[PDB]
Amino acid sequence: MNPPPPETSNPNKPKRQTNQLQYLLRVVLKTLWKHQFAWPFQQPVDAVKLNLPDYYKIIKTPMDMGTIKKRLENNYYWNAQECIQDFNTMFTNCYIYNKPGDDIVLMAEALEKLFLQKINELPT
Numbered sequence: 786m787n788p789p790p791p792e793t794s795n796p797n798k799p800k801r802q803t804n805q806l807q808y809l810l811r812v813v814l815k816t817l818w819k820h821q822f823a824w825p826f827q828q829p830v831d832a833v834k835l836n837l838p839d840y841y842k843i844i845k846t847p848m849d850m851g852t853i854k855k856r857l858e859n860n861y862y863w864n865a866q867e868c869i870q871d872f873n874t875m876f877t878n879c880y881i882y883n884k885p886g887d888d889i890v891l892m893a894e895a896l897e898k899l900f901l902q903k904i905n906e907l908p909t
Contacts, residue, residue, distance in 0.1 A: 788841060790829045791848060793855035800860040804908045809868050810857040813903045818850060820899060822892035826850045826875060843882050848874040865907070872900055 817823060828851040832840040841847070848871050855861075862868045879893040 786833050787829065787831055788847070791852045793852060793861055794859050795861060798861070798863065801863060802860060803865070805865040806857065806860075806862060806868070808908055809862075809865060810854070812906075813872075813900065814850065814854055814857060816903055817896055817900060818854065820896060822895055823850065825889060825892065826896065837882075840882060844878045846874055847878060848872075850875065869904060876900075 818827065826849055829847055829849050830837070830840055830844070832838065850872075853868060853871050853875070856871070857868065876893050876897045879889060883890045
């Protein structure tokens with residue numbers, strides 16, 4: 786069945802709020818979240834509901850935008866790079882599990898293109 790979702794808080798990790806982290810939530814995450822293709826990426830993959838018996842045999846580092854959103858809201862990220870890495874992991878997992886030309890892969894591709902355009906404008 787499904788694993789616990791990724792951690793979204795770490796009480797032993799200090800917290801800080803920077804312009805880059807704020808931009809990642811209010812601009813990058815929010816724009817992708819509202820995209821027409823966002824829903825499959827808004828929460829952890831549910832292999833039980835979707836009937837994907839080998840998903841968590843193939844994907845050992847799951848990631849999703851619901852987790853990313855909560856991490857940003859909880860100030861889980863100290864470095865902007867941590868958040869960028871999570872988005873990258875989310876897209877890469879989709880490309881690993883699925884096949885070229887699948888609907889979900891085309892959706893990931895569109896979201897990744899938009900992600901790159903938005904992180905291009907990340908403030909200094």
